[PDB]
């Protein structure tokens, strides 16, 4: 026989990622982060183990995200363990997004906001805001506090006028449950448009629900004050509950 290339041969030749992959922006990996591409945690997981260092985590941005949507939290956690604690400033956010949807399944809702607090939406992707926000609202389960309004308002630009009704409602789901004083003690954003604005409406609501002539008018009042506010273009049902309210003399 001739000598071709016969040497040690443990396996066919599995080449592991000894590289961290250069910093080039993804094509699919972010598509699923956009909602422009669809796949399972399984895919995000399937590539993760096959991918390079920062790409493992990069794929896990999706993987964990998806996994805890699926409901599997500790499954999301175990590979959450896999992603870095200390990324770049924006990439930090990208994994911390996951931490939230994890906590949300852990009923660590407080811890979820805790992570949401580390993240900056004005920093991440517009859509990764919404991904982040949907984890925020979830942490604000109807928890009468600003971070609810802060959150669904926050996704309002990201979403639709069809999701707005939702936003509008979940926002009001703070205002109607939140207190004037709470509302008055809240912490608003940088935009500081919609958030405190929303409250003005509950301010009138807190007094006016069962006082129709001023409630609906107070509604139509606030909406003038903050037309900018999603609610001022379409108003929630709980203030609308003046319509829906008791007998109104006419």
Swiss-Prot record:
Summary of the knockout phenotype: Absence of both LpoA and LpoB leads to a decrease in peptide cross-linking and to cell lysis.
Transmembrane segments: none
Superkingdom of the organism of origin: Bacteria
Localization terms from the record: Cell outer membrane
Subunit structure: Interacts with PBP1a.
Function, in words: Regulator of peptidoglycan synthesis that is essential for the function of penicillin-binding protein 1A (PBP1a). Stimulates transpeptidase activity of PBP1a in vitro.
Protein name: Penicillin-binding protein activator LpoA
Species per Swiss-Prot/TrEMBL record: Escherichia coli (strain K12)
Lineage: Bacteria, Pseudomonadati, Pseudomonadota, Gammaproteobacteria, Enterobacterales
Full protein: residues contained: 28 to 256 of 678
